[PDB]
Amino acid sequence: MIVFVRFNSSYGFPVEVDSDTSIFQLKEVVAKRQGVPADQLRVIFAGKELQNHLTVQNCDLEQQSIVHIVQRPQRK
Amino acid sequence: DQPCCRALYDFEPENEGELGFKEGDIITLTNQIDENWYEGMLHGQSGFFPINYVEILVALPH
Numbered sequence: 001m002i003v004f005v006r007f008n009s010s011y012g013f014p015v016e017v018d019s020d021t022s023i024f025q026l027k028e029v030v031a032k033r034q035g036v037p038a039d040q041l042r043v044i045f046a047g048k049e050l051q052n053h054l055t056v057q058n059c060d061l062e063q064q065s066i067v068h069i070v071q072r073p074q075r076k
Numbered sequence: 077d078q079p080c081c082r083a084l085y086d087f088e089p090e091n092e093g094e095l096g097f098k099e100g101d102i103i104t105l106t107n108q109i110d111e112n113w114y115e116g117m118l119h120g121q122s123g124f125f126p127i128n129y130v131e132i133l134v135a136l137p138h
Contacts, residue, residue, distance in 0.1 A: 008128045044085050047099045068085070070128045073112040075091055 001056065004066035005030060012066045019057040023050045030069050042072040079105045081116065081130040095123030103130065 001019070004012030007030055015029055023043050031038040043050040045067045050059060061067070081103050089096040097103055097118050103125070107115035113124045 047086055049086065070126075071112070072129075073126055075093070075113070075124070 001063050003061065004064070006066060006068045007034065008068075008070050017056060019055070021056050022052070023054045024052050026067070027052070027069065034071075036071050040071050040073070041069060044068040044070070077134075079134045079136055081105045081114065081132055083129070084131045085129050087125050087129050089123065093123050095121060095125045097125065105136075108136065 001017050002014045003017055003026070004014050005026065006012035015026065017026065024038065027038045027041040027043060030036070030041060045059070045061060045065065050061075050067070083097045083099055083101040083103060086099045087095070087097050095103070095116060095118055101118065103116040103118045105114060105116040108127075109115050109124055112127055114127050114130065115124050116122070
């Protein structure tokens with residue numbers, strides 16, 4: 001399945017995933033690409049923040065869907 | 077005239093001082109904390125929020 005990942009950009013790069021792929025994995029894809037910690041990356045789809053332990057077949061993520069993945073800072 | 081930002085996404089405050097807002101909300105941007113945290117006011121509430129979570133209508137004087 002193809003999903004478009006957008007990192008604070010205008011466009012989105014297509015990533016080939018599967019039905020059991022977890023959000024964590026999709027995050028790591030961007031993590032290794034931008035050199036940014038996966039624990040600081042968040043995924044937003046349709047105005048909804050996707051939970052790390054969620055999988056493709058467990059959300060409204062379908063073929064040719066676009067997602068917004070960005071580094072969400074935390075102040076603690 | 078007043079620098080304002082458009083909430084492109086939903087931001088829920090999980091920490092103390094974070095400014096919560098919903099998608100489509102207009103926040104009164106007033107200051108910048110760092111390269112990722114923005115400071116503004118919404119409905120009287122003041123706090124900070126991520127820069128990559130909003131859109132810039134009017135840019136800051138630079």
